[PDB]
Amino acid sequence: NDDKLYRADSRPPDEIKQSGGLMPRGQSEYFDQMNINLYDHARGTQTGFVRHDDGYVSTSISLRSAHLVGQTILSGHSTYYIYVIATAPNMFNVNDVLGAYSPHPDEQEVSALGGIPYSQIYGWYRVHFGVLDEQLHRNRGYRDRYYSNLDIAPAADGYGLAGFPPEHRAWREEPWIHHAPPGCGNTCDEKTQSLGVKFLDEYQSKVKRQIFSGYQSDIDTHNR
Amino acid sequence: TPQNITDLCAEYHNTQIHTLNDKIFSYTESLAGKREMAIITFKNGATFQVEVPGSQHIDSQKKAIERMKDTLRIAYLTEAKVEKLCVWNNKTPHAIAAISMAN
Amino acid sequence: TPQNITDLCAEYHNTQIHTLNDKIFSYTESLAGKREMAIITFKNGATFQVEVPGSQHIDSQKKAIERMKDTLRIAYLTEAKVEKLCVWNNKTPHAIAAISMA
Amino acid sequence: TPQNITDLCAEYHNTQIHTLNDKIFSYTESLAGKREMAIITFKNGATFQVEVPGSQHIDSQKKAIERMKDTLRIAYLTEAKVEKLCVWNNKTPHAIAAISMAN
Amino acid sequence: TPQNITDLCAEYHNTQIHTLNDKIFSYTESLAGKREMAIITFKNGATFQVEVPGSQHIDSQKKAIERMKDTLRIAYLTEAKVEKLCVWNNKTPHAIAAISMAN
Amino acid sequence: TPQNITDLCAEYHNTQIHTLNDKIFSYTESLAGKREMAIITFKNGATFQVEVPGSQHIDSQKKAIERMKDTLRIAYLTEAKVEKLCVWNNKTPHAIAAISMAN
Ligand SMILES: OC[C@H]1O[C@@H](O)[C@H](O)[C@@H](O)[C@H]1O
Ligand SMILES: OC[C@H]1O[C@@H](O)[C@H](O)[C@@H](O)[C@H]1O
Ligand SMILES: OC[C@H]1O[C@@H](O)[C@H](O)[C@@H](O)[C@H]1O
Ligand SMILES: OC[C@H]1O[C@@H](O)[C@H](O)[C@@H](O)[C@H]1O
Ligand SMILES: OC[C@H]1O[C@@H](O)[C@H](O)[C@@H](O)[C@H]1O
Ligand code: NA
Numbered sequence: 001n002d003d004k005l006y007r008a009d010s011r012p013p014d015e016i017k018q019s020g021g022l023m024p025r026g027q028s029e030y031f032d033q034m035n036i037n038l039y040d041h042a043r044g045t046q047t048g049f050v051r052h053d054d055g056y057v058s059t060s061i062s063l064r065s066a067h068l069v070g071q072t073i074l075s076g077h078s079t080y081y082i083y084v085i086a087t088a089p090n091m092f093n094v095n096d097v098l099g100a101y102s103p104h105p106d107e108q109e110v111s112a113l114g115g116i117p118y119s120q121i122y123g124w125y126r127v128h129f130g131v132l133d134e135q136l137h138r139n140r141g142y143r144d145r146y147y148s149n150l151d152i153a154p155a156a157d158g159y160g161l162a163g164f165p166p167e168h169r170a171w172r173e174e175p176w177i178h179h180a181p182p183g184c185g186n187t188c189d190e191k192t193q194s195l196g197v198k199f200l201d202e203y204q205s206k207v208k209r210q211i212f213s214g215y216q217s218d219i220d221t222h223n224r
Numbered sequence: 225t226p227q228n229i230t231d232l233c234a235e236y237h238n239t240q241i242h243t244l245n246d247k248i249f250s251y252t253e254s255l256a257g258k259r260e261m262a263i264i265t266f267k268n269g270a271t272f273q274v275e276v277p278g279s280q281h282i283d284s285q286k287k288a289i290e291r292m293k294d295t296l297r298i299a300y301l302t303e304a305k306v307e308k309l310c311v312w313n314n315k316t317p318h319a320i321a322a323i324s325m326a327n
Numbered sequence: 328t329p330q331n332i333t334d335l336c337a338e339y340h341n342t343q344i345h346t347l348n349d350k351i352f353s354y355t356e357s358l359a360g361k362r363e364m365a366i367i368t369f370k371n372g373a374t375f376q377v378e379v380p381g382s383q384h385i386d387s388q389k390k391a392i393e394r395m396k397d398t399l400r401i402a403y404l405t406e407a408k409v410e411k412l413c414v415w416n417n418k419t420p421h422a423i424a425a426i427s428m429a
Numbered sequence: 430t431p432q433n434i435t436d437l438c439a440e441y442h443n444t445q446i447h448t449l450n451d452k453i454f455s456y457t458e459s460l461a462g463k464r465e466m467a468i469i470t471f472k473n474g475a476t477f478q479v480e481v482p483g484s485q486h487i488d489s490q491k492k493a494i495e496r497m498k499d500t501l502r503i504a505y506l507t508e509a510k511v512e513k514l515c516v517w518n519n520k521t522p523h524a525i526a527a528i529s530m531a532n
Numbered sequence: 533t534p535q536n537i538t539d540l541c542a543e544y545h546n547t548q549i550h551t552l553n554d555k556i557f558s559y560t561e562s563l564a565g566k567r568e569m570a571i572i573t574f575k576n577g578a579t580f581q582v583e584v585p586g587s588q589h590i591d592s593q594k595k596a597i598e599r600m601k602d603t604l605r606i607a608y609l610t611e612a613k614v615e616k617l618c619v620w621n622n623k624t625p626h627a628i629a630a631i632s633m634a635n
Numbered sequence: 636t637p638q639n640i641t642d643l644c645a646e647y648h649n650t651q652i653h654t655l656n657d658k659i660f661s662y663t664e665s666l667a668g669k670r671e672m673a674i675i676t677f678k679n680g681a682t683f684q685v686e687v688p689g690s691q692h693i694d695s696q697k698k699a700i701e702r703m704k705d706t707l708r709i710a711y712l713t714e715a716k717v718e719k720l721c722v723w724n725n726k727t728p729h730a731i732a733a734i735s736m737a738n
Contacts (some may be wrong), residue, residue, distance in 0.1 A: 018635070029714075062350075066727065141263075142406070143405070143406055144406060145304075145327070146303065193337060204508075205452065206505055208508050209507045210302060210303065212503075212506050212507045213302045214302055214405040215606060215713065216503050216506075216507075217405070218397050218605060219294060219397075219503075220291065220294060220393060220394075221290050221495060222286075222291065222492075223390070223598070224698060225364075225419060225420065226362070228331075228366065228453070229355050229366075232355075232359065232362055235362070249531060250531040250532075252527065252528070252529040253496070253500055253527060254437060254493070254526060255438070255493035255496070255497050256490075257486075257487050257490055258487075258489070259430075259437060263432065263433065263434075271432045273430065274358075276489075284363050284380065287363065288363040289358050290496075291396065293356065298503075300530065301503070302404050302466070304404060306498040316430065320358070321358060321359040322356060323356070324355040324359035325353060325355075326353035330571060330581075330625050332560050335567060335593070338564075343627065353593070370608060384565070385565045387565065387568050387585065390568070391568040392624060394561065394598075394601065395561070401605075401609065402609075405609055410558070423563070424564045425560065425563065425564060426560065426561060426562060427559070428558060428608065429557060453738040454737060455718070455736060456736050456737075457639065457735040457736070458730065459699070459721070460696055460733070461643065461646075461647065461721070461733060462693050462695070463695075464637065465698070466695060470647050478636065480696075482695065490648075495698065495702075498702065506710070506713050507717055517711075522638060533672075533726065533728065535727075536663070536674065536726055540663075541663055543667075544701065572710055582666075589668070590668050593666055593667075595671070596664075596665070596671040597666050599664065599701075603664060606712065615661065618665070624713070627662050629665060630663065630666065630670075631663070632663040633661060633662050633663070633711065
């Protein structure tokens, strides 16, 4: 459906265009390796950014929620942005995947495996010196019909990517026990890495198809 | 001139509208001799062709047939929802005369 | 000559600017008989054709009509905001003469 | 006329169907004289050409060769899974006659 | 043969480079008679045309003029950064001889 | 027939392979008279051209030079890795004869 997610970020829309989206730490381009771990990502301390370490960038379920987290982290900024983001299968309810071991349950946050591509970003509010601006700038790269026909990933697709250490009791409990990568509970850390790499490969295939087919829809054969 | 695909389809004999409201399930393309055509399906089984050009087409149709093969290839790919196809029901499969795309 | 779509509209008889500032709601395309054309609508109901190539068109327009149908199709399939259409209002629906996007 | 790539292939001598269900790993095109062609491969080594236009092609296939090379370039850059290829097995690489893509 | 756009421009009279390093702000095309042309603008207010095909062009330019309007169109639609534009300053608006694109 | 780009180049005396494994850093095309060409560069400074159509080219290469320009543009905009280029090295910059793409 057409639900949105929200994220405060210091990086302006100029930089996001060039980066192919809002990236994780260390990732420079969307389609360009790096640790991909959901458990390590949600535990990570926020140092000037809303959580974007270990392969994921984090979001908020509402505008109000994104703005309060933006004032805890990026209060110093004379100009930061709140990005409006479409829900899609690159995205994961962190409280549902990690379950009882969700590090910050009150935050109610949703994290994109591999960053949020540019075309998934609906738009952005500017936030001049603490104050949210009413006007919503709309991203030209956004594709409403595509992303309004997609939702977040279900927790069932995320239980195997949860990324707990092999000695963690989560792997011998439900629902994670039936989804454990070989070597986890009863080579785990390398097997969750490679499952995360394949997941991002197959999601990247899906956004390339939508965006790069749009770019080649001008072709006319009959004119030589 | 018709304002829509339905009025356009009424101006032709041996013809009929299909309401799909769905993206294309499959795209098929051929350069084999006498079989230079496109074939599309949808999830519910319904199959359609862009005809091989022949004596039945007038000269001004030739540019639009090739245009129509472009539209279908790239509508398949962008997963674009096709509202309707006006087709000729005296061929097997039914042959496309027009397409509309919406929502 | 002209540096914008509004000024280019002022050079021709039977034309008017339509200001949409909106992406195309639908794209129709026909290879049928004497209706080798494209029609587009918007959310407000407004409808526009790219005309069947005919005796109203000089030979340099032939290629430009094929380009306009290429342009409308990619604008639709990328959701590009179209700013204006200069059209000919003495035909039904209004025949696109030009397009701008900002 | 045929409703799908399999039944279409069987109309021609020296053809087989290839079931890839996979994106193209490489695209290669040439403008060099007498080698005006394309080549695609898949990850573990399957290879396919679109042939140089020549005396083995009737007039109506010439427009369709140009299109097929476009189709494969688009599929390559979009990482779109290809379902099948009908091919002539009497050329090396196997010369593509048709292509289907599902999903 | 030149290694870049700056040098291409130096081979012609009445030309000049414009270093923009920005996306096209607006794209405009016309199919009106005697006005079969494209006009692009930028945020800084600069306006450029691709000229109407006429007697100032030799035959080998016709396909390159059509090509340039295609290039200007997807550059606009993808928000592609244009590095430079070679243009003729004996036309108003200045007419595009060449484009170059980079980060 | 060549089975890959490396084979294609060894069929001509006056060519070589460059291995880039890198996307195009800049794309440049011109409509100016007698310079209707394209020019790409990579970040290492390597420059390449799609030659102006001429008397070195036979008729079947004409369509293929236009394909190559299409290919370089869309490759540049999608940031697709270029694997190899077959090129004629009796010209500066080296003229493209073929291109392969792969990650
Ligand atoms: O324009 C093509 C059409 O021509 C008609 O005359 C024929 O009856 C149709 O089946 C269709 O082929
Ligand atoms: O150049 C084409 C135009 O010609 C005009 O004379 C006519 O009013 C319009 O119908 C339009 O088609
Ligand atoms: O239509 C072209 C085909 O023609 C056949 O005669 C030939 O055996 C095939 O390899 C293929 O080239
Ligand atoms: O390629 C066409 C060009 O021809 C030149 O002679 C003229 O000065 C330019 O303004 C431009 O029109
Ligand atoms: O296909 C074009 C090529 O033709 C070759 O025979 C010539 O030696 C090369 O310099 C190149 O121009
Ligand atoms: Na959504």
